Amino acid sequence: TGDQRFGDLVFRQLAPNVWQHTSYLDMPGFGAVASNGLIVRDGGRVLVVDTAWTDDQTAQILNWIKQEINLPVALAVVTHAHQDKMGGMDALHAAGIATYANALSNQLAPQEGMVAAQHSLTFAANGWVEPATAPNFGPLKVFYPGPGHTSDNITVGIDGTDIAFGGCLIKDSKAKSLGNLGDADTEHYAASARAFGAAFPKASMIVMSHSAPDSRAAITHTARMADKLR
Ligand SMILES: C[C@H](CS)C(=O)N1CCC(CC(=O)O)CC1
Ligand SMILES: [Zn+2]
Ligand SMILES: [Zn+2]
């Protein structure tokens, strides 16, 4: 429990079968930026949400899983086509892991400097993933909340836990800004943040890319800040 340093990465147990992975990249004007994703054990397999920033860091996530869990990684899903979430796709492919992203993330990946995932998720008009596109996802419940941080951003709840992951859409309850809005839909952000909250009403622990886990005040605060963009 608590933070475990493993090379240049940090791992933190959040629930009996859920860990947060954290990796860092220098960005001028922002410093060494943390990005979080998730590792979930579902019976005899492991599921990953988001890569680390780089292939080397992502291979270290797989090394941590080997050491600490020692079960095969059945699949990975990534939450949009920016480097913090998709930068390590080649490491997953080298390891033989099946990879999934929003169809739109895969379409955008080359222009964003990313390698596409192998499989494309599609979404119903109400935002829930079309189940045939997310086979064998076990407790991962994938939801497209609308355009926000990016047009392609997706979110993931973990069935059987109190955890939902907002990726880079959600910031914590004390954040001063919405971060990188360069690819954002400023008109729709607030609604998208609120739709994430409404999709996962029982999630009391909100995990996000660039803050430590928080309560649902992360959602309300993020949406209230995004009201300013309209
Ligand atoms: C590469 C990523 C893709 S979301 C990015 O653009 N940034 C990292 C996060 C910072 C905001 C922060 O430090 O919390 C903005 C810049
Ligand atoms: Zn992003
Ligand atoms: Zn990000």
From Swiss-Prot:
Keyword Cell division found: no
Cofactor-binding details, from the entry: Binds 2 Zn(2+) ions per subunit.
Top-level taxon of origin: Bacteria
InterPro entries per UniProt: Metallo-B-lactamas, NDM-1-like, RibonucZ/Hydroxyglut_hydro
Keyword Membrane found: no
Cofactor(s) required for function per UniProt: Zn(2+)
A Pfam short name: Lactamase_B
Annotated positions binding substrate: K171, N180
Cellular compartments annotated: Periplasm
Entry binding sites for Zn(2+) 2: D84, C168, H210
EC number from the UniProt entry: 3.5.2.6
Reactions this protein catalyses: a beta-lactam + H2O = a substituted beta-amino acid
Binding site for Zn(2+) 1: H80, H82, H149
Chief location: periplasm
UniProt note on regulation of activity: Inhibits by captopril, thiorphan, dimercaprol and tiopronin. This enzyme is not susceptible to inactivation by the beta-lactamase-blocking agents clavulanic acid.
A GO CC annotation given for this chain: periplasmic space
Assigned protein family: Belongs to the metallo-beta-lactamase superfamily. Class-B beta-lactamase family.
Role of this protein: Confers resistance to the different beta-lactams antibiotics (penicillin, cephalosporin and carbapenem) via the hydrolysis of the beta-lactam ring. Does not confer resistance to the polymixin colistin or the fluoroquinolone ciprofloxacin.
NCBIfam families, alphabetized: bla_class_B_core, bla_subclass_B1, blaNDM
Protein name: Metallo-beta-lactamase type 2
Lineage of the species this protein comes from: Bacteria, Pseudomonadati, Pseudomonadota, Gammaproteobacteria, Enterobacterales
